Amino acid sequence: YFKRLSDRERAIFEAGITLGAIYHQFCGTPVSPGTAEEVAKCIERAALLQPCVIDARVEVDVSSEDTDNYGGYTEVSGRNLRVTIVTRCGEWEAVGKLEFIEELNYPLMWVEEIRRV
């Protein structure tokens, strides 16, 4: 109510929120090699508006072999989307990552680092 989380905990909470939000808002977005940098930037800028987010790095890894289809384009998906987000509440930073992990066959979300400033 609504302040039970210490801010280390909040930094972890907000990294989780931003990773899930980014993934679900943007997966499905039509994208090409020519687009894919500008889309990545809009995603970062959208992530940087969320509570406690102080850094967002997004890559949408698309190549022309991904656009060999009637449409001539592909979509943002767990397969081509990679995100690092840094969150800071008070003196604590958390580092959240999204990346398709081949061995897991799955776009994993994890906490890379939790860090006192």
Residues in touch with a copy of itself (CB under 8 A) = 1-2, 4-5, 9-10, 12-25, 27-32, 35, 38-39, 41-42, 45-47, 49-51, 68-73, 75, 78, 96, 101, 104-106, 108-114
Q: Which does 56 bind (CB under 5 to 8 A by kind): a copy of itself, Mg ion, none?
A: none
Contact 54, 88 (CB under 8 A): yes
42: its two tokens: 């809009």
Q: State yes or no: 14 annotated in a binding site.
A: yes
Task: Give the chain's end-to-end CA distance (angstroms, integer).
Answer: 26
Min separation Cβ 50 and a copy of itself, Å: 6
Say whether residue 30 binds Mg ion (CB under 5 A): no
Q: What's the CA gap between 86 and 111, in Å, rounded? A: 10
Q: State yes or no: 91 annotated in a binding site.
A: no
Min separation Cβ 45 and a copy of itself, Å: 5
Residue 9 neighbours by CB under 8 Å, 6+ apart: none
- Alpha-helical segments (H) within 1-117: 7-26, 36-47
Among 17, 27, 109, 114, binds Mg ion (CB under 5 A): 27
- Residues annotated in the binding site for substrate, as ranges? 14, 109
